[PDB]
Amino acid sequence: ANPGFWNGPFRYLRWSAHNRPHLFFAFAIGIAGPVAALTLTPLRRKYLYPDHSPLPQSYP
Amino acid sequence: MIINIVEILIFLVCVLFSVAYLTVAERKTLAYMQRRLGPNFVGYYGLLQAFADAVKLLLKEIVLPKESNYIILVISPLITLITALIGWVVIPLGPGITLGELNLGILFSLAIGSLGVFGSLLSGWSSNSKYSLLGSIRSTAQLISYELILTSIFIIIIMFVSSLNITTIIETQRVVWYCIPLLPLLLIFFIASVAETARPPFDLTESESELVAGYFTEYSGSPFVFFFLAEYSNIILISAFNGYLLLGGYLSFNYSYLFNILFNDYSYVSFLFEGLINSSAYAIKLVFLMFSFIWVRAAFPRFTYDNLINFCWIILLPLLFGIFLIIPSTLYIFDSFPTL
Amino acid sequence: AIPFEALLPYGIIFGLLTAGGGAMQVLHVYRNGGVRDRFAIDQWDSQMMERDLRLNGGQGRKQVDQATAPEAFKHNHVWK
Amino acid sequence: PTDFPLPSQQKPNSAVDYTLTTLDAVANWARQGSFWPVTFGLACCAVEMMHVSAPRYDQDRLGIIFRASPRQSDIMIVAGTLTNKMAPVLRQVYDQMPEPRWVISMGSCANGGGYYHFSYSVVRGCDRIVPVDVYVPGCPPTSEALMYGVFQLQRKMRNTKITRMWYRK
Amino acid sequence: IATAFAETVKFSGSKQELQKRTLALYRQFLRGAPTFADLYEVQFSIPTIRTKIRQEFERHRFVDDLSIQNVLYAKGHMEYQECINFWKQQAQFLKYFPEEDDIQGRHQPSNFVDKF
Amino acid sequence: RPDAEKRIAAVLESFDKISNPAAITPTASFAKDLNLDSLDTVEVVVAIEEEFGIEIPDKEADEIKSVNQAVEYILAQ
Amino acid sequence: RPATWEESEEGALSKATKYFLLAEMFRGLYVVLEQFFRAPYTIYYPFEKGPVSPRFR
Amino acid sequence: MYLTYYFIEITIFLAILCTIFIISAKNPMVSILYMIALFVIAAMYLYLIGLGIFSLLYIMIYIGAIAVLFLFIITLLDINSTELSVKSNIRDLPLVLISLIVLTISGLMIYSNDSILINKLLEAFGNDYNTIITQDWFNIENTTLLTTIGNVLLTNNAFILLVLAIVLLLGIIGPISITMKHK
Amino acid sequence: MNTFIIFIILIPIVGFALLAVNILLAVYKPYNEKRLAFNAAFILVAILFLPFDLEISTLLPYVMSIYLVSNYGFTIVLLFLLILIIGFVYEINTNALKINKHNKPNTDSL
Amino acid sequence: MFIGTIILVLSFLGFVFNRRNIILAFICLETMLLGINLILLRNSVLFDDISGSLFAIVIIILAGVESAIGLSLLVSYYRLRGVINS
């Protein structure tokens, strides 16, 4: 049986996800976290501001 | 002062009488699952076997010259006191609105489920047998390694909650049926839940006669019924704890009881009924859960310690750290965070 | 068909926790009087519910029925 | 002192017993109900013993749920033939066993030596080793036979009369 | 493909070599005596073990043939093998030790008159 | 060396079959001086190694014939 | 003597699905649940008896 | 005033009574059995003082992890114990420990406030006598929070959190590269 | 008082109760007959258990107040989890037992 | 602050007069780190919200790694796992 081998990355991700896949599908979640966290600044398109508060002491 | 002590006696007799008939229940359902019939003979119908077995196995009481009685006469009482019973101090959704618990829920249950582990370890420490205590260290090692991924997942499901008192999870979860419908890692919680309270398909330190014709120590007598009752009571507690947070209490027919109680009662006749159906909801969410424990008792065989540590520290835990690389991420993405 | 015997222990394991929930509900409405029960709104009912205890029992809507400001409570405790 | 009232009394056989028949029958029923052994299980007769765990003549319809541990046990079914080599291990198992203990000799070889009985290496019956309370005849006795011996042992348990023997009947 | 306490089977030819080999066997069989008393928890003392081991070898002092002494050496080294660990049990182990007299009561004084 | 053979001539004196301790010259034979059996020779050798709590190899047990040899091997620790 | 390399094309990410969640094992749970509903086989031995052939001893 | 519920605070007597066991045990591990009793008495103290949160933290992480690890080690490679505090091993004990207890009592006295005398040494021992603190009422506390403010400070002082990330990194890499012994 | 203190006080006495029932009426009459080894994976598992507990203790206040730290507590804890997950990718490479005796080398002749 | 100084001092001079059992010394050195927190927490309670209790959660998280390195170093107080030695 064959492990993963780096030098062909399109091949590596294949024969990682097919022979020792159980860390692949973890790290797919690990890349779905922050990369999708960077594809939101257009995707919220200024959706909402939460607007919470402690006590509003006002001005003169 | 009198009402709360009769409260606490009702709740203790519920849990004790419950865990008494639970062993008869599981043996019956194994038996029908094993194409036979369970205890069908005891006394009056056949619902009574454990309730006679408790009186049976009191009256044995041996001691062993290889070990101080002072530890093994108390260490199965230790996990009987702390692991079984005062886990119910949190009143793990004592199924109404009300509880017998003030507040600050989930990490108390964490602390006591954590506290049971050296109750197992010091139990296995006994008798100074060079083949025994290595099996004890095996048991406790796999026990803590799945304690960790109970812990690190029910702290991430409360990231949809952020409030640490007991009820606020439950009032939060009634909108979505939040528990499993938004996330199916319930199942890995379930497969974590068989390990941290080992009534398992793992059976791992119960190498019953692979050792010198004894598995744990064979501390038979009152410590035996203590260990037995505390294991089953830890099972129904952690099963309730599953039905507490990551499986839901407060079934949606009580949400629809706005369209039912307004068609049934006029105005607040001593709150006579709603706590009962709420208890019915939580009970049917709890026993249907442990029916799967009694499945997995008799479906898949023991699980091979080296592969068990493989199953902890290699697969489930990195999937887990991915899964709370996204549940902070995805709610931050989609709209926003929860308040408290 | 269904196992008539095997669901009898599940029936009593259902009924015991059912009565156990109903008893908690009854004993808390008898504890609190004919109302539901408050959760821990920490630091806040100890302003609010303590103030209700300084005035009345249960709840009341009026102007004020205090006397010596209805005996303003002041908590004291030993040094650690 | 120096004088005696005590007359000619009955055998251990009575019916006027206030509360001691009831309490003793409750404790005796508890002991008679669960009733688990430890397998010692040496030969063919153990194959019939595990046929009593088979679904046809189930143990658990009676309560017989055996552990593999001589302290957590009540009765010690000796099944199979009993070698000369085994017998000290058997008596050592027998001693580490709590005091309300009984022995079932399951199988002809286990009592009076059975079908070998004329070996150098066999023990001519476990009566030379452990005290026995119920015998079970024949090479392999039926699962029927083992359960009949179990019910006869429980019928013996129903005459143990231990509490009223504290009362010295 | 294994041993347990290095039991070897190779009978030499010369009676001097067999003498030396039984001598070293006697040393190990004598050295293991406190290990025996530890292992089996006998009532009697370690010198009782030693005088009975000496008795057992004096039972076969005057055996002529080296080709009998071979299998006597094998029996000796082999029962050393089965004594150096816990293969033998104490009920199996007391078959060497006619220790107590009081089991017998009054008995035969080796006279003809008391055969009757 | 000094008073090691005091202990040895205590152990061998405590050992039986030697009715004359005056016949025990220290630097003297075992089987010539005292008529010790070849079995009894290594018997008292094992008695000696058990007294000093020390363990000997096989050839060291082979070479011992007089106790000056024994003291000379006792000297190795 | 089948050489049987069997390197690739067992599945195309379906393999990761069946490995990842316990589909082959949930199948066994469904089997024992379907077995749960069917008939038992106990014979109430004081009241009922197993088959006694005429040639039994 | 519920007479015992005022001296329920003074549980320090059980602390010193457990710690006098903790250095004179019989077995090497009945001591570390008593150590978790010391920790749960500390938890009782912290729940009584007003912070049950850190009581439950100590129950979760000390007797949940590190005391479990002491028990975990003390099964295997058990060290050779001297038996107990024998009188020959209580030799040179009193002759320095009495003076050391006095000097450390003076150190606890040196924790006092500002007096350049021995008056502050007596002042802290009478600190409970002239004083019982007066609690107050809720002036504008909007949201309920106990350890939430701890995480607020862990956001303000974020850099020590990102550095104790490195110390937990060391806590896992060290035991790899000191015990695994690669091939 | 009066709420659950009753439970944690009643329960130890119930434990001593069901213990101390049969200490008296069970028959005792006790007649008679009543260093070590290792592995790295028996020790390093529990050693490495502890830091991954108390990083969850680190994470627990953050998940308590996830709010009041918006858009920024997320960033800090993502950096924390990155610094921890690289420790996980260190420990994935090594921790397993090794079967000592299994040989396969080809056989040669002269 | 009697409550923390007394347990600290007794752990300290237990670590001095410890002519038995290296691990009792090791756990006395552990219990120093919870004799100090009973000082720190009650000073924070007598003062305020989170100023010193932040240092308290720091010293707990770090006392874990203390005991971890101490165990995983005490394992190597010898040869490793087990061999012949003396």
Ligand SMILES: CCCCCCCCCCCCCCCCCC(=O)OC[C@H](COP(=O)(O)OCCN)OC(=O)CCCCCCCCCCCCCCCCC
């Ligand atoms: C994507 C959108 C959503 C995003 C959120 C994602 C949430 C998804 C929910 C969680 C994901 C589930 C992950 C399940 C983890 C299980 C992984 C696993 O078990 O791996 C198999 C592994 C096999 O062992 P190994 O040989 O080492 O593998 C290498 C082979 N080359 O390990 C093993 O040895 C197998 C041992 C498993 C033991 C299981 C025993 C039976 C359990 C069945 C009972 C559960 C059924 C009841 C609950 C079901 C309710 C419907």
Ligand code: SF4
């Ligand atoms: S009694 Fe009969 S069945 Fe049992 S071992 Fe002997 S020959 Fe076999």
